[PDB]
Amino acid sequence: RVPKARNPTVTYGKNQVIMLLYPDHPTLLSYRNMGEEPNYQEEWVMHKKEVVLTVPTEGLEVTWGNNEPYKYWPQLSTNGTAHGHPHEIILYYYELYPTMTVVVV
Amino acid sequence: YEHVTVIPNTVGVPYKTLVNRPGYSPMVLEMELLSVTLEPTLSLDYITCEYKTVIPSPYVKCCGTAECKDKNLPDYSCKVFTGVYPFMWGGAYCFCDAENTQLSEAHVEKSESCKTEFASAYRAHTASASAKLRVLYQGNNITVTAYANGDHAVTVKDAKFIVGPMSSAWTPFDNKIVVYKGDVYNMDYPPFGAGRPGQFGDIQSRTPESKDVYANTQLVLQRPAAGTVHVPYSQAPSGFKYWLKERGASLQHTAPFGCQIATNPVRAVNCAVGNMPISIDIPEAAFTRVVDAPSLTDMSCEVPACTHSSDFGGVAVIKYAASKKGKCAVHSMTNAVTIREAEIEVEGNSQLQISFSTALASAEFRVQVCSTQVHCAAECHPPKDHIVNYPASHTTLGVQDISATAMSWVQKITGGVGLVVAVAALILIVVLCVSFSRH
Ligand SMILES: *[C@H]1O[C@H](CO[C@H]2O[C@@H](C)[C@@H](O)[C@@H](O)[C@@H]2O)[C@@H](O[C@@H]2O[C@H](CO)[C@@H](O[C@H]3O[C@H](CO)[C@@H](O)[C@H](O)[C@@H]3O)[C@H](O)[C@H]2NC(C)=O)[C@H](O)[C@H]1NC(C)=O
Ligand SMILES: CC(C)CCC[C@@H](C)[C@H]1CC[C@H]2[C@@H]3CC=C4C[C@@H](O)CC[C@]4(C)[C@H]3CC[C@]12C
Prior knowledge:
This is part of a larger assembly, with chains A and B. Chain A has helices at about 85-95, 100-105, and strands at about 10-15, 15-20, 25-35, 40-45, 50-55, 60-65, 70-75. Chain A is of the alpha+beta class.
């Protein structure tokens, strides 16, 4: 028989997942990208910690301790908006596709 | 009717395909992959497990010299020490201290624990790829299982389903893998009979039950402490124990493309790589002639709202006048917009409601019902949330062509500059013409 770590407190930002871990004992936290290059990373946590993960377009898979894995994907959210004024439109597309935006403009 | 389509290997995502058989009503099928498994062929090279060192009681001979013979045990050594004068709890071992020698020997054997606790070193070849496919056929849910090699076709409900070959030969498993339990690792294990001390493979056998054992523990017999009969030695610690502590992450956690790894048998599950061709033999009973099918006229579309939430956040309502009661098939005429419903019912004069998912900031698309296409368009809003636990239901927006509407600013600026060039070009042309004529 093995224990299962407490469900973490989770909040979200732009292409970002923030977790608060509350272990009783040392646990292993690890994650991988679900794309071609998994960029596998792992760490041990022996205390309450704030962990910030970056979410790729392909999606991110996160596994903590003996718990079932979580999967996350980004949405096309903006602080700018489509339509409206020309500067509102550029911000909208910049936030979603910043690389291309700088090239097209 | 033979219908051939190709879908992505992404698991848990439905795809819509249109069946076009002239003279009959267009039909729409829905396909989803429920599971894709890549099961490699393995050939066992050897078993690695813990070893035990066996040391028989030492032979102590005083007033004379001890001797021994070579043995053919997996790792054997024998040595004789001189000048030994051992004591027992009740006094000196023997009467004389002259010409005293001690005969020591030791050998390595496989542990009995190797029966249950061991790692297997395998060579991997190709995989017998197969998949579980869900198909929505004539409103019915049909589930089929088959090999993704373009063979071993299976017929269900008189429909013949052929899947594969796979567009990719990708596997998370390399040529050399080691299996301990539920954890598979990619490791360049050493050749059989070439193991080294303190490292994985220090002790090897071809099978768990085999009596043919290779070992390299660098076991060296040392001189005993004076007054004692103990047999000291120098030997490397088991490489198996070191490996278990230093295994690191297994493929289940490190594999690319979101592959799931399982053992007994070793297999890769639901790898998001490439695509899978599907061919379906459809019975004529599934086709309704256009003369028998219903027909729709006076069709129009409106959009109460649209949000590109990636989860069917768009809604559209289409008004129609039906010639008669019956069913029709609904299909998008663009790859930018996905319609959730495969089919709708039509009766008299009414309206139908469907949901859709798009990456477009401005939705511009045509909806095909029973051969009566309607153009529909509306502005879409962004989602409030940033992160979801599901994959998008739609496809990508990756073309410069799909920029939003109210982009007339681009056309106005481009046209304005183009006009300046066109005018300047005309001015120069006229002057050149006049200059040419003058001599
Ligand atoms: C078979 O055709 C469709 C699709 O087949 C689906 O069946 C369900 C039971 C699952 O096995 C699913 O994996 C499979 O794709 C059937 O329509 C499905 O009914 C689902 C009932 O559970 C329903 O799914 C979701 O919808 C409800 C209501 O919006 C929502 O609360 C839940 O998320 C729910 O799971 C959905 O209507 C549809 N499947 C999906 C996922 O879209 C249909 O019932 C069957 N027809 C027959 C009898 O041939
Ligand atoms: C006032 C004028 C300049 C507004 C122009 C807005 C233009 C420059 C912005 C708004 C939306 C943007 C596009 C959004 C989507 C894509 C798809 C991406 O895969 C490549 C970049 C591309 C094609 C962007 C190019 C730049 C873009 C078209």
